[PDB]
Amino acid sequence: TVIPIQHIRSVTGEPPRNPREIPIWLGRNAPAIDGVFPVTTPDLRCRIINAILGGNIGLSLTPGDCLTWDSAVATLFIRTHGTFPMHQLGNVIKGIVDQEGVATAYTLGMMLSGQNYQLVSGIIRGYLPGQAVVTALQQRLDQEIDDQTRAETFIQHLNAVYEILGLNARGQSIR
Amino acid sequence: TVIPIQHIRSVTGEPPRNPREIPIWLGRNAPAIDGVFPVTTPDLRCRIINAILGGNIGLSLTPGDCLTWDSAVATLFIRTHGTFPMHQLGNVIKGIVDQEGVATAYTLGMMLSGQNYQLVSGIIRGYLPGQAVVTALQQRLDQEIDDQTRAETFIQHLNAVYEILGLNARGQSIR
Amino acid sequence: TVIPIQHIRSVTGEPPRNPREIPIWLGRNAPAIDGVFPVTTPDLRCRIINAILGGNIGLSLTPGDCLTWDSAVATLFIRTHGTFPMHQLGNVIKGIVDQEGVATAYTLGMMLSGQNYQLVSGIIRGYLPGQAVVTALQQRLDQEIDDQTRAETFIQHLNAVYEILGLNARGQSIR
Amino acid sequence: VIPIQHIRSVTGEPPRNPREIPIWLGRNAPAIDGVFPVTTPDLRCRIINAILGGNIGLSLTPGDCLTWDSAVATLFIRTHGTFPMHQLGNVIKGIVDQEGVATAYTLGMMLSGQNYQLVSGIIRGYLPGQAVVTALQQRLDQEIDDQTRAETFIQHLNAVYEILGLNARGQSIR
């Protein structure tokens, strides 16, 4: 098939000039692309990403690297920053909860970490937006069964608590 | 399918950057978008809404949210204002009347509240432009059968009463 | 049934801000609109007009008001200038006669008036080029049998008189 | 002969500013019901008209005195000029600062025709402190249905306030 690239490329806009800014820009603009043209297979995700980023032979992915949008955004992260050691996962995540907030940072941290729920849960508990959140979120995760259900229910609970207290995603009050 | 996003995005234009102006922006382009393309299934509402919002943070919808234009417009309110829309319907209606006019504020009024003629009718009757109009408009709406008949014939009547007195949608004299 | 709004805007341009300048802009650009995408019913004409004027609820039309590109134009002029705006209709016509000439002033005036032969006829007869034309034109239109027939054979007779005297469209000589 | 003086001892003299007469009647209504039993709409109309003394402007007829809520709501339209539900959020915000959350729930429900969802949502925004909002919601969520939550809201607020050392007006011991 031929893909409607001129339309996709009018909805997203030009990708930023600093290539360290590219891997998060692609996460923000994913739902838009799925709107214009529903992306079903890894192939079609690759075809779409490769055309948008144009002349960068640097950042060209294959079908292996992009099963899901979250794989692509991680692969593109490792290239533009470099693989870093365990003790530096702190400064990567804090840097992101400041720009995009906890839900983005949890999903990327769980991906740059080989799904280490005990590590990435622990780090995110220091950058939550006030003590009353830290405590309310804890109780919900606590009364789950094991760590595997806690990993898959995290963002559900985070947002439920953020709703009650009436915060936006960036984690600031809007009332 | 593929949605005709080139066209839909000409009716609509580019969205406001102040992100608690968005539910009212999408609220008053919804009637036009439905003319230029038949949006039937919640999957297509979600696809269209997500395409025309572009790269904005926390503001993609799910097909769960987008069952009716109302439900969507209420959900984008909750994620921006923090509160439910129907805990401040008064302040929102008054704010629109002052910029856009009665017939605008009536329309968004019954999106936000959820087609509650009684309440929105009563909040508007407050902000009509002069005592004379209020009495005029009332005797037309008292000669319909049901409150179902009155919620179709409300703009038709306001537009007839404004002709007689010589006012101009935004509620200023032509004379 | 996708109404191709992007193409229609490519030909007409963007409508003005000051909504007093909309009813004439729509009459002028009408035969272009209709060449890109040919309308057939009132239904479609409504859907096209509302989509062009965009997110404007105040100047929204219904199928009732759109039997013809003239009926639509007339309805908008009464919402913006009010009924019996005879000093303003005097002023919009005098303006055109100077830029365009009398055969253009006639058709735009008759469109904005709801095809009011008696009113517009009267206004134009004060802006013709000199006493001899007025008298020559009148003698021809008086031989005609009813007012429907005068409105049909007005641009016809004005041309015949202008040709004899050796004037061009703008009422300046070519001898 | 209706025993007006016992009712006058509990209530007191009406407030001078016409705008605060509707809230005053709502706060004094539960105490009047305990001291003297009111069983008919007609008896209620005679008691309210005597308590306000000679106010011909705010006189109520037997039809609008069916329930204490209907009487308080009618006085609001005569004193302010707008129906209450149109501006409920502002009215609840005024009562919370002057009197407290418990007064706002009782008077907010009388003006809102017993709507739990609207009153509970408006009050949650003005509750004192983030901890109070989270603790109260957990207790209310356990209850089986909206009717049961409505009956136990004041009891569950008093328990949370006692644990966090807050007075009725929400001022901390620290």
From TrEMBL, chains A, B, C:
Keywords: Capsid protein, Cytoplasmic inwards viral transport, DNA-binding, Host cytoplasm, Host nucleus, Host-virus interaction, Microtubular inwards viral transport, RNA-binding, Viral nucleoprotein, Virion, Virus entry into host cell. Signal peptide: none annotated. It comes from the Viruses. GO terms for biological process: microtubule-dependent intracellular transport of viral material towards nucleus; symbiont entry into host cell; viral release from host cell. GO terms for molecular function: DNA binding; RNA binding. It is found in: Host cytoplasm; Host nucleus; Virion. GO terms for cellular component: host cell; host cell cytoplasm; host cell nucleus; host cytoskeleton; viral nucleocapsid. Involved in capsid formation and genome binding. Shortly after infection, interaction between incoming particle-associated Gag proteins and host dynein allows centrosomal targeting of the viral genome (associated to Gag), prior to nucleus translocation and integration into host genome. This is Gag polyprotein. The chain holds residues 303 to 477 of 648 of the full protein.
